[PDB]
Amino acid sequence: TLRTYIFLDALQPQLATFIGKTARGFLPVPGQASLWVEIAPGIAINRVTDAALKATKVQPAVQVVERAYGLLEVHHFDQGEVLAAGSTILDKLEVREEGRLKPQVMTHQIIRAVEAYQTQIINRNSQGMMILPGESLFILETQPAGYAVLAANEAEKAANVHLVNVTPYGAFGRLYLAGSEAEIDAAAEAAEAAIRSVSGV
Amino acid sequence: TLRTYIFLDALQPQLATFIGKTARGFLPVPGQASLWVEIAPGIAINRVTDAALKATKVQPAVQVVERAYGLLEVHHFDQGEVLAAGSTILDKLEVREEGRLKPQVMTHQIIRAVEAYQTQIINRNSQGMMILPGESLFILETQPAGYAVLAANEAEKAANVHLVNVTPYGAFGRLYLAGSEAEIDAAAEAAEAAIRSVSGV
Amino acid sequence: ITLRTYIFLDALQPQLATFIGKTARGFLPVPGQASLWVEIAPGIAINRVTDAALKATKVQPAVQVVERAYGLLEVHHFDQGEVLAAGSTILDKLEVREEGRLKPQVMTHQIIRAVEAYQTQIINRNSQGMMILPGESLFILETQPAGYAVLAANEAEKAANVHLVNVTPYGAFGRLYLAGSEAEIDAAAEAAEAAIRSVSGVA
Amino acid sequence: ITLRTYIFLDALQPQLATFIGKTARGFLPVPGQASLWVEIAPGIAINRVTDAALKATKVQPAVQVVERAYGLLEVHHFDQGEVLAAGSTILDKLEVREEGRLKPQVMTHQIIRAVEAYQTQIINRNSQGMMILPGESLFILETQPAGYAVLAANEAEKAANVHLVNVTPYGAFGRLYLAGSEAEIDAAAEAAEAAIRSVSGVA
Amino acid sequence: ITLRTYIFLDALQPQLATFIGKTARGFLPVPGQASLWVEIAPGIAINRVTDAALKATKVQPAVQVVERAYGLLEVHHFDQGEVLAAGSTILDKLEVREEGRLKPQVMTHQIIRAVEAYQTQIINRNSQGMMILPGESLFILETQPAGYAVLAANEAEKAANVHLVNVTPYGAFGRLYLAGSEAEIDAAAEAAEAAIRSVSGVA
Amino acid sequence: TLRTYIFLDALQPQLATFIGKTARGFLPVPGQASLWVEIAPGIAINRVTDAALKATKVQPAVQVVERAYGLLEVHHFDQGEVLAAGSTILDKLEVREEGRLKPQVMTHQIIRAVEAYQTQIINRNSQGMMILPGESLFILETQPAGYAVLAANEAEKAANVHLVNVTPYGAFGRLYLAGSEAEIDAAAEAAEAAIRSVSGVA
Amino acid sequence: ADALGMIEVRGFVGMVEAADAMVKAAKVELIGYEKTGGGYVTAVVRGDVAAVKAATEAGQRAAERVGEVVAVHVIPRPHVNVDAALPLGRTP
Amino acid sequence: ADALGMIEVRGFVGMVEAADAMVKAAKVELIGYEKTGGGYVTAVVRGDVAAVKAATEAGQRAAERVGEVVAVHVIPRPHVNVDAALPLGRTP
Amino acid sequence: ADALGMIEVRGFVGMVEAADAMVKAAKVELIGYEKTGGGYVTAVVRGDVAAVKAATEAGQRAAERVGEVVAVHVIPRPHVNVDAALPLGRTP
Amino acid sequence: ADALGMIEVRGFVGMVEAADAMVKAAKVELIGYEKTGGGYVTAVVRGDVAAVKAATEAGQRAAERVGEVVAVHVIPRPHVNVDAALPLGRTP
């Protein structure tokens, strides 16, 4: 099946940097168009990855087969190569773009003026930016897991927030953002508007 | 949704030392009163942690976010601060104390005279006290997972057992205890009587 | 206690035994030994199963993985009689016969010809066994439940000279990455599918 | 027992306290607390010294590292009286005053304007603190002995708006990766260099 | 090839055998077997020496560590004649007499009594063996060469009722953390120091 | 001080596969030209790396600032591009090409018909190909460490072996090759001939 | 299990003085005495090691005032085969 | 049948220390001790030839600390008439 | 069929050590041993050409220590009439 | 299987003396003797490795007095192919 299929037009620098910290493939640089495909069962993603890599010149960064779900990232500077790889992926899955799962937001919250006792734990459970005590925290879960990176990317299009964490694979996709109060408010509005704009089933 | 809400009047020294080996926060010392709150969905515990840390002077040690479940521990020397943090948590969740899931015991078993070929593997798959050959192993699973540490506490209030392992998060809560035969018998009876004395759903 | 997998490997081929030497957390097996894999649910009962073997026979256990909810156990010895007696003791203590195992379902079987380098680098980073090289065919397999996957590995190496890139026998799905040239991957795929589809059980 | 590094931090600036709390094996410090770093050779002898802190005063340890050759101890508390009393107790148990410490040798200080994206992927993969974004200036610093590197972090955040990418105060050399806009990194570089070579010691 | 450590553990006591089996990369030793530790410099030449063991006798290896500079090999088997024959074959392949080993020199030995909880949190995050509870006495031991530390483990458990918290026989210096009540730790300290000081060799 | 400066003319596929299995950065694909520079002290390699990345179009795979030394790999298809990055690196170092250290063979040994009990150890201590019980093993130690990948290139260039391990960082460089006996003899003679024909400061 | 303590005196008088001062100095259990001929008699106490260490070093001090004390030794953990074979009061 | 190992100590303390160190240091059987009078006692370990030879070399090493070691010897294959006529725990 | 390796030793002990080192140093098959009298015995191993090339150059280097190695030879591909007539263990 | 020990003597008398001293020296098993012609005879004992390692080094010292000793060697574990091919009394 097809759980997640989102076309990012470009990677903002904290998201591309975080994928550079986390991924196990060819790391993306900022300014590249990118594509995320999550399927079930997961091990068929090597069919999908090959289906991209025979078609276009794109390079894959993330390929994680976690428990039953297979996540795949590809990227290139030209948007046309990434969209041609996405069309070839959808031809190989014999579906279209609308057959993806419409993401449900499990939890969206804004914690204002986080105590130091909570920032130390959040910093130990995160790989991106360090949250500081007194900063406000934006928290997000999306199902399926992939669409969270869309909620990352558009967020950095809006506000000056620190990408603390994003996990795009697994059962629940997670997003930790940090910053001052108005920045977290604007980024929260942008991330909720980006998740609500995904058509699906 | 609250799954586990268990209070501990005092952490026994091997439980406090095990959480000192495993946790990613302000590690507890023995004698401190403690509190474990597990909720579903997981990421919502980053609200609930805040709901403790704006009320009292408790320190959070464990905050684990699994695929779907979230576990929080808070502790302080004075029991009243921990109970006030627990009352503030139950006020924030709008759920009473008995709205927690009543724990069911998946497996309670005692293996007499564990041979060396099994002790080597159980030692490689654990982080507490090591088990020696010839020592009887008590095995426990509880669902939900957080209640496992209740069985990790009261059992050490019964006999001279070595805490081999306790896992309080994820699908099933797990407890490996080890010691001589009568001590394992008394500690197993105490752990089963501790799990059976918890009201809930 | 449910018996998800009960499979008896009559002989470990050298890449499977070498892979278990890379990954296991027990007494590592050597090639030529007879092996046995028992997977149950819930996982924590496998410690009760392992003792049931270790008080019975002279077998030595290599793998004991306790997942979220499943439990995988491997025992092995040079003598097939010791290993089958340990399996008989395990089935006597479970009081479930050999047919009570879950019959394995093949979720995905694929053969990818001429894997590009951009995919081989990621496959090599995400797998522990033999490295795949760019330009070589890849065989992909998943079985539910997971403990049959090593069987799908083992008979595959009894087919043709294929690499053992990965075999994960524990989880919700058992995974198998094999690599090699086209005809060898074809023979190994035919042998592994014939070995999985010859296993009886329940569904 | 040789006293290499004895440095006292009067107030933990929040990114250093955050990064220490991300790397500590102990009790995590919160920002604003006073902090203290003692480094000796040999390593395992620091397990004596830590005891002499915790028996005497109210202080709490964050980072105790007994690595291949040397040994490093952090103690921190809100009151500077308790931290200075633990420092005097440490230096009485070592029977060495402050002046027996090694003067920090500044072996490398380099500001790299507009770090390319291909290099930021490496630096972000090697680091545990912040992430450096492409185009931001980098400041790298190497001191010997290594413990004074946390001083070089603290004063840096005390004088500019930078990001603490990494600091390694244990091992052969003390490494410091800062990153930010160009003027902020020039201010942080001047402040960190002056703070390192504005202390006493024995060369 | 320099022979640093050559020690023959005549019978593995259960906490040392359990700790080695918790840390060894190989065939796990079981309590009761005879054992042998050989450390040479440089490291990779131990792959010659290991072959000379495994072609000669029936002994099984557990720890073969080729670290940054040195190299360590453990071989263990029930019959003490088998392990002594493997030791003789190792010392012939090295072309050395036995007494060319470095004499173990006790660098740091300290009984830290009634350890505070805060130091136990760090020691328990820095150790894979037993825990240490607050208030129990600790025994830290450093020896050079590193491998003799496991002798300092073995004889210690051969004396009194202690908890083996850590032993590292690989690296620059061999470390030993023991823990327990005070009389047990005093008996273990006398026994471990008398074990290390009675091993001859070149200095 | 420029310890190693080795230019790999073409990455062979098991070496490129193993580097991409252990790289912190951009994974090299086979056929690309590559380049390895080790200097002492370590963190000064970030002076070096950026310099090449400001000059040419090369991409870095392995940059290791470990306990004592510093290691940099750069790789690209065009060999003129990798050589231009190398000349930029040597200009930033202000040394010539032959300011390197001539590689010392600390230990070389072919161990024939390895028992299974040692292959379990070697396979547990390796991130490359497996060794099977009975296959011959070639171990190699070089100083300084970076030249180890040179010994992993030419050997694979000259026989049908398995690359079990190559470590080009740390105090000493290590090389574990494995395969049938004739192929391991050819690969060992090729590795020694690759190490011998490298000039520098002895 | 229980740590072992021994005072051997060439003489029954010094042995009874040792076996008196050992059980008066701390909490050890006197299990018996072994007569090995030639005037050598050996008093054997048995308890936890923190008490038998304080017991034997006081019993030696008191038995050096009346007689000749041959050997004084404390075994912190005797093996179970020793308690099976040699008569140390804990014969199963 | 099995190999024979002996520690003779003038005094009971050194013999019990030797008979503890022997059954710790190897997988042997302490079949007991022979009292020849005069203060001499002989502890007898008895087992396979590899373990008794490495057990008596620990019993000697631990009985010289506290005792006067009279004689130490190992017999790898004792003759059948020796086991028939002398008390060494293999009386048929 | 397969290549042929031989070690001739004046002495049975040296030949047993050579025949052990040969089969431990590669995958060769010791098919037997031939007694030409006068104290000369010949160990004959057999397998593919590189394995017997390693086996004999380990058996020589391990049999000069204990014996007197007369002759070493490796035939990389013997003629089928040699296997048919002479006793090399592959006689059809 | 069991470890192997051999004495080669130029003479039947020295071989019988060595084969007597080996089985009187430890728990070994004289399985037989090999006549390689020319007056060379080889006595073969076979047991666990410490027993044969003591027995051959005793039988050598007892056989050098009364004869010419050519070779003495102990193999702690012979390969399965050696005991399958060469006649050492352990051929299944």
Short mmCIF file of C-alpha atoms in Angstrom, two decimals, chain F residues 3-202:
data_model
loop_
_atom_site.label_atom_id
_atom_site.label_comp_id
_atom_site.label_asym_id
_atom_site.label_seq_id
_atom_site.Cartn_x
_atom_site.Cartn_y
_atom_site.Cartn_z
CA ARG F 3 51.67 11.79 7.45
CA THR F 4 49.78 10.14 4.58
CA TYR F 5 48.99 11.51 1.14
CA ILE F 6 47.73 8.71 -1.09
CA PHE F 7 45.76 9.20 -4.30
CA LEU F 8 43.53 6.30 -5.26
CA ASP F 9 43.19 6.24 -9.04
CA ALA F 10 39.98 4.18 -9.08
CA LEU F 11 37.95 2.86 -6.17
CA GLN F 12 37.36 -0.85 -6.52
CA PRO F 13 33.84 -1.97 -5.53
CA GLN F 14 34.44 -3.72 -2.20
CA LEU F 15 36.60 -0.84 -0.98
CA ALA F 16 34.02 1.72 -2.11
CA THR F 17 31.31 -0.42 -0.52
CA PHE F 18 33.20 -0.68 2.77
CA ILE F 19 33.96 3.04 2.85
CA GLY F 20 30.31 3.82 2.19
CA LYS F 21 29.47 1.37 4.96
CA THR F 22 31.70 3.26 7.41
CA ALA F 23 31.67 6.85 6.11
CA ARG F 24 30.51 9.89 8.03
CA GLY F 25 29.50 11.96 5.04
CA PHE F 26 28.90 11.44 1.33
CA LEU F 27 29.19 7.86 0.24
CA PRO F 28 31.55 7.08 -2.64
CA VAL F 29 30.37 4.92 -5.53
CA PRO F 30 32.75 2.61 -7.45
CA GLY F 31 34.76 4.01 -10.32
CA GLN F 32 35.29 7.41 -8.71
CA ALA F 33 38.77 8.70 -8.02
CA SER F 34 39.54 9.18 -4.35
CA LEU F 35 42.09 10.82 -2.10
CA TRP F 36 43.29 10.36 1.49
CA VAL F 37 45.22 12.88 3.60
CA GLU F 38 46.23 12.29 7.22
CA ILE F 39 47.96 15.04 9.19
CA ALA F 40 49.01 15.70 12.77
CA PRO F 41 47.55 17.58 14.69
CA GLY F 42 43.97 16.57 14.10
CA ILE F 43 41.44 19.40 14.11
CA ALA F 44 43.56 21.47 11.69
CA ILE F 45 42.13 19.17 8.99
CA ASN F 46 39.06 21.44 9.06
CA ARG F 47 41.40 24.11 7.70
CA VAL F 48 42.29 21.64 4.97
CA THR F 49 38.87 20.21 4.06
CA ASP F 50 37.15 23.56 3.48
CA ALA F 51 40.07 24.61 1.26
CA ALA F 52 39.44 21.72 -1.12
CA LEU F 53 35.71 22.36 -0.90
CA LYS F 54 36.29 25.97 -1.85
CA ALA F 55 38.40 25.01 -4.86
CA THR F 56 37.03 21.97 -6.65
CA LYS F 57 33.82 19.98 -6.97
CA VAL F 58 34.99 17.05 -4.85
CA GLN F 59 32.82 15.51 -2.17
CA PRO F 60 34.08 14.30 1.22
CA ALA F 61 33.29 10.90 2.70
CA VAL F 62 35.46 10.25 5.75
CA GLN F 63 36.68 13.04 8.01
CA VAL F 64 37.94 11.67 11.31
CA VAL F 65 39.35 13.89 14.02
CA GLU F 66 40.11 11.12 16.51
CA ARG F 67 42.18 11.13 19.74
CA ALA F 68 45.46 12.16 18.16
CA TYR F 69 45.48 12.54 14.36
CA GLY F 70 43.32 13.85 11.54
CA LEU F 71 42.06 12.10 8.40
CA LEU F 72 40.32 13.42 5.28
CA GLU F 73 38.94 11.67 2.19
CA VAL F 74 37.77 13.48 -0.94
CA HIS F 75 36.39 11.79 -4.03
CA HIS F 76 34.99 12.69 -7.44
CA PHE F 77 34.66 11.19 -10.91
CA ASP F 78 37.14 13.45 -12.72
CA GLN F 79 40.70 12.60 -11.69
CA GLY F 80 41.81 16.12 -12.59
CA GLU F 81 39.26 17.40 -10.09
CA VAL F 82 40.56 15.18 -7.29
CA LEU F 83 44.16 16.06 -8.15
CA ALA F 84 43.26 19.76 -8.12
CA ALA F 85 41.69 19.31 -4.68
CA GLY F 86 44.87 17.54 -3.63
CA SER F 87 47.09 20.37 -4.82
CA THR F 88 44.81 22.82 -2.99
CA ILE F 89 45.16 20.69 0.17
CA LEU F 90 48.95 20.66 -0.21
CA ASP F 91 49.00 24.43 -0.72
CA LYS F 92 47.03 24.89 2.50
CA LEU F 93 49.47 22.53 4.22
CA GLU F 94 52.35 24.41 2.51
CA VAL F 95 54.15 21.11 1.86
CA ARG F 96 55.06 19.23 -1.29
CA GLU F 97 53.51 15.94 -2.35
CA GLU F 98 56.53 13.92 -1.17
CA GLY F 99 56.43 15.37 2.32
CA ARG F 100 54.58 12.26 3.44
CA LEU F 101 55.86 9.45 5.61
CA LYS F 102 56.99 6.35 3.73
CA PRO F 103 54.64 3.53 4.79
CA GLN F 104 56.07 1.03 7.26
CA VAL F 105 54.78 -2.55 7.28
CA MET F 106 54.49 -3.28 10.99
CA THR F 107 53.14 -6.80 10.46
CA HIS F 108 52.06 -8.89 7.48
CA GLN F 109 50.91 -12.48 7.84
CA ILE F 110 48.92 -15.01 5.82
CA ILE F 111 47.13 -17.45 8.13
CA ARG F 112 45.96 -20.46 6.15
CA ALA F 113 42.81 -22.50 6.87
CA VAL F 114 41.45 -20.49 9.77
CA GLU F 115 39.50 -22.55 12.31
CA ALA F 116 35.84 -21.73 12.84
CA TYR F 117 36.57 -20.68 16.43
CA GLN F 118 38.70 -17.78 15.18
CA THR F 119 36.34 -16.81 12.36
CA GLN F 120 33.64 -16.20 14.98
CA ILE F 121 35.98 -13.66 16.63
CA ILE F 122 37.09 -12.04 13.37
CA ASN F 123 33.53 -11.82 12.08
CA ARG F 124 32.42 -10.26 15.35
CA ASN F 125 35.25 -7.71 14.99
CA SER F 126 34.59 -6.71 11.37
CA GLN F 127 32.29 -4.45 9.39
CA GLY F 128 33.13 -5.76 5.91
CA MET F 129 32.76 -9.16 4.31
CA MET F 130 32.42 -12.31 6.36
CA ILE F 131 35.21 -14.82 6.63
CA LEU F 132 34.15 -18.42 6.39
CA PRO F 133 35.79 -21.30 8.30
CA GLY F 134 38.63 -22.74 6.26
CA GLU F 135 39.35 -19.70 4.10
CA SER F 136 42.81 -18.20 4.27
CA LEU F 137 43.27 -14.87 6.04
CA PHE F 138 45.68 -12.01 5.36
CA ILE F 139 46.33 -9.52 8.15
CA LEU F 140 48.34 -6.36 7.60
CA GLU F 141 49.42 -3.50 9.83
CA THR F 142 50.73 -0.26 8.35
CA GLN F 143 52.05 2.94 9.88
CA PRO F 144 50.74 5.57 9.30
CA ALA F 145 47.17 4.43 9.14
CA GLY F 146 45.75 6.07 6.00
CA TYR F 147 47.89 4.00 3.61
CA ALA F 148 45.89 0.95 4.72
CA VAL F 149 43.20 1.88 2.20
CA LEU F 150 45.89 1.88 -0.49
CA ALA F 151 46.62 -1.69 0.55
CA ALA F 152 42.90 -2.36 0.36
CA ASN F 153 42.65 -0.91 -3.12
CA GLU F 154 45.45 -2.55 -5.10
CA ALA F 155 44.94 -5.95 -3.48
CA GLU F 156 41.29 -5.93 -4.50
CA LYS F 157 42.48 -4.60 -7.86
CA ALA F 158 44.58 -7.74 -8.36
CA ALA F 159 42.67 -10.76 -7.03
CA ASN F 160 39.24 -12.12 -6.14
CA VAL F 161 39.26 -11.74 -2.37
CA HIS F 162 36.87 -10.65 0.36
CA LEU F 163 37.51 -7.35 2.11
CA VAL F 164 36.95 -8.13 5.77
CA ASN F 165 38.30 -4.93 7.29
CA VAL F 166 40.36 -1.83 6.65
CA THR F 167 40.92 0.79 9.34
CA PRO F 168 42.76 3.90 8.09
CA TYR F 169 42.46 5.87 11.34
CA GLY F 170 43.89 5.54 14.82
CA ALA F 171 47.43 4.73 15.82
CA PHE F 172 47.95 1.94 13.28
CA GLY F 173 46.20 1.02 10.06
CA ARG F 174 44.79 -2.47 9.77
CA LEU F 175 43.85 -4.66 6.82
CA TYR F 176 41.93 -7.95 6.95
CA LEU F 177 41.58 -9.76 3.62
CA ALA F 178 40.18 -13.25 3.23
CA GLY F 179 39.59 -15.80 0.52
CA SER F 180 41.06 -18.85 -1.15
CA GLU F 181 44.78 -19.39 -0.83
CA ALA F 182 45.98 -18.50 -4.34
CA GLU F 183 43.89 -15.33 -4.45
CA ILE F 184 45.16 -14.32 -0.99
CA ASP F 185 48.76 -14.90 -2.09
CA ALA F 186 48.21 -12.70 -5.16
CA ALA F 187 46.48 -10.03 -3.07
CA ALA F 188 49.21 -10.04 -0.42
CA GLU F 189 51.97 -9.72 -3.00
CA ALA F 190 49.98 -6.90 -4.63
CA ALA F 191 49.50 -5.12 -1.29
CA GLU F 192 53.21 -5.31 -0.48
CA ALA F 193 54.05 -4.05 -3.98
CA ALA F 194 51.64 -1.15 -3.47
CA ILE F 195 53.19 -0.24 -0.11
CA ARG F 196 56.78 -0.52 -1.41
CA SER F 197 56.36 1.90 -4.34
CA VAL F 198 55.38 4.93 -2.22
CA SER F 199 58.11 7.49 -1.55
CA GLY F 200 58.34 9.99 1.26
CA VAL F 201 60.15 11.01 4.43
CA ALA F 202 61.42 7.78 5.98
#
